[PDB]
Write a protein that binds this ligand. Structure first.
Ligand SMILES: Cc1ncc(COP(=O)(O)O)c(CN[C@@H](C)P(=O)(O)O)c1O
Ligand SMILES: Cc1ncc(COP(=O)(O)O)c(CN[C@@H](C)P(=O)(O)O)c1O
Lengths: 357, 358
């Protein structure tokens, strides 16, 4: 039933493709949230050539080390408790630093080794980071800290890089460049969108997440293959039933789809209890034996119903592709009006993980 | 302190008892499919040794239960997907639904060391799984003649619209079910949460509570589990990781979708759609910080959610956040987000820590 198939060859291709688009920049492969659904630890072991791995939280970084990953790991949101710092230091984790608590803990600690730090600037997203009017003094303190390995590096993040007509990205960049002028540290602002559409945003390090897995960061119906990146994940399953159904007959909860002809319906061992979106409407495409058929009626917790046709020869046990070869996850996102980020990431533990190539 | 689902075992024990009170002559299939609706498959079964059976979606789930030392009957609600599984099903004493010719034939043909208990699945208008009325009679008779099937054969079905008491579909499913079961031996089951709570003439021999067992309403009518005397089981909790100044006219989050009308303080929660919190949440969805309600502002992101705390708010990094739980029913989050409560509780990721209390 519900299996996630992760293509190791597509992953390696994608990193090397992204090196070619930003060839003067180092790569933090962003692998937080179980590597956007593809598997934290297996994704990292597929990519030895990364210059670092990026995570959201310290626990993710420790999971990497527990599985034998020795590469530098960047804590994108820094650390949430002052007692974390000896572990961070001894693990050689690079840490973002974005608030007073973290900075004060760095100043007051006594650590066996200094830690590499990326100071986070709020250039416009207004999520994490030090606002421009607090930044020089916050920076100056970091440069004066024995527990911080000089130089201090500088990181920000784009809020609207997927909308080039906007002008938000160029403002974010001017705040960034203004602050960076005359400082020695490395600089990083671009994730998938910056790498693809803003070559003046590449600087020393870039940070691919979504494009590394061969899925587009943009909402214009582009797919990773538009950018020469190969889709990594297939979500697949099989039919468990093929049944007769009649004209005028509803299917599923609320009877939300009614058949206008006699037909055969298929039942897929996949639902929202696996991660598949309950917001997917009737007519959403699935592939059965490599041909597109439509979802009919509401998605259920463990089952989806599709219309196969009145004399279709599909059988229980036949392969189904929710997204993969012939059906990019961006096309599912468009039809369901869910971010492709969320579709690939918000899958449950019920799905089996399979690795190929 | 980070993304954590707290499971209140006392609430769970109460709910099963409370449901027995509402269906006093009926045995209980505790439905624990999809990791017990997000609450933990094995731990939820461990909390409920009073259940008469456990109900799962797939053979793999049943086996996991056996693997963690659960010994009670397990019902395979969808049956089995490969004939080669029948020996395992016999020897684990799983009960299985049977809904198609493939399964029927597999039982007729197999040589098993012990027969298996069977619930014949009747399609009564859901049109998802099950044998149709015009086929069901011959299919039934074949099950009564199979030496690999315990007699009598039991009969199951499931409602499509039990959550609309104004509507006639439930009464038409019942009449179809009642016609078929006239004069047959063996146990009858058609009610799950909706059926149990609203339709007492559907209770029959076995009822199969899912969502209401976890203290969550199966309706989209503003009712909560507490409306029916069931106590919420799950709390989705986390922490603030930042409290930040913010100015009038400044937007927050991706696409700058929310702009503050005043200077304020923002809080950032260690929670996002990579944990299972729905990206769909609009600005103004409630979150509890230090017990009090504050609105989501800007888009839910993969690992973080931003909330608007107010300009001299004294919340700090490290303080507790409740996404749903005590003081904030998941049904409220369902309604504000236009997500089904089912999906909300169930579609969490493996990054969430599980903790069990009482
Ligand atoms: C600091 C930072 N640097 C890089 C990335 C990778 O992003 P892409 O997938 O757009 O390349 C992110 C993640 N961004 C979203 C998934 P989210 O904000 O929802 O976590 C990030 O936060
Ligand atoms: C046969 C069967 N018997 C009982 C239950 C329990 O239902 P409640 O959660 O409404 O009590 C279900 C589950 N039904 C939906 C969650 P879904 O169809 O989305 O999986 C089921 O399929």
């Amino acid at each position: 039933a519900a299996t996630v198939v992760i293509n190791r060859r597509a992953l390696r291709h994608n990193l090397q493709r992204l090196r070619e688009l930003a060839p003067a920049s180092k790569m933090v492969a962003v692998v937080k949230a179980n590597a956007y659904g593809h598997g934290l630890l297996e994704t990292a072991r597929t990519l030895p050539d990364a210059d670092a791995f990026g995570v959201a939280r310290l626990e993710e970084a420790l999971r990497l080390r527990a599985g034998g990953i020795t590469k530098p790991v960047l804590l994108l949101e820094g650390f949430f408790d002052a007692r974390d710092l000896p572990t961070i230091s001894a693990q050689h984790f690079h840490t973002a630093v974005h608030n007073e608590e973290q900075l004060a803990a760095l100043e007051e600690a006594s650590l066996d080794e200094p830690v590499t730090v990326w100071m986070k600037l709020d250039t416009g997203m207004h999520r994490l980071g030090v606002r421009p009017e607090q930044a020089e003094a916050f920076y100056h303190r970091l440069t004066q800290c024995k527990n911080v390995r000089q130089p201090v590096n500088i990181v920000s993040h784009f809020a609207r890089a997927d909308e080039p007509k906007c002008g938000a990205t160029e403002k974010q960049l001017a705040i960034f460049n203004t602050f960076c002028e005359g400082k020695p540290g490395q600089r990083s602002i671009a994730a998938s969108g910056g790498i693809l559409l803003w070559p003046q945003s590449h600087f020393d390090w870039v940070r691919p997440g979504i494009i590394l897995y061969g899925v587009s960061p943009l909402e214009d119906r582009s797919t990773g293959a538009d950018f020469g990146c190969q889709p990594v994940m297939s979500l697949t399953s099989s039919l468990i039933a093929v049944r007769e159904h009649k004209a005028g007959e509803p299917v599923g909860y609320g009877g939300t789809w009614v058949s206008e002809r006699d037909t055969r319906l298929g039942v897929v061992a996949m639902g929202f209890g696996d991660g598949y979106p309950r917001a997917a409407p009737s007519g959403t495409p699935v592939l059965v034996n490599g041909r597109e058929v439509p979802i009919v009626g509401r998605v259920a917790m463990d089952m989806i119903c599709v219309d196969l046709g009145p004399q279709a020869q599909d059988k229980a046990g036949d392969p189904v592709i929710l997204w993969g070869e012939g059906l990019p996850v961006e096309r599912i996102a468009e039809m369901t009006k869910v971010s492709a980020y969320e579709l690939i990431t918000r899958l449950t533990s019920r799905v089996a993980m399979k690795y190929v190539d």
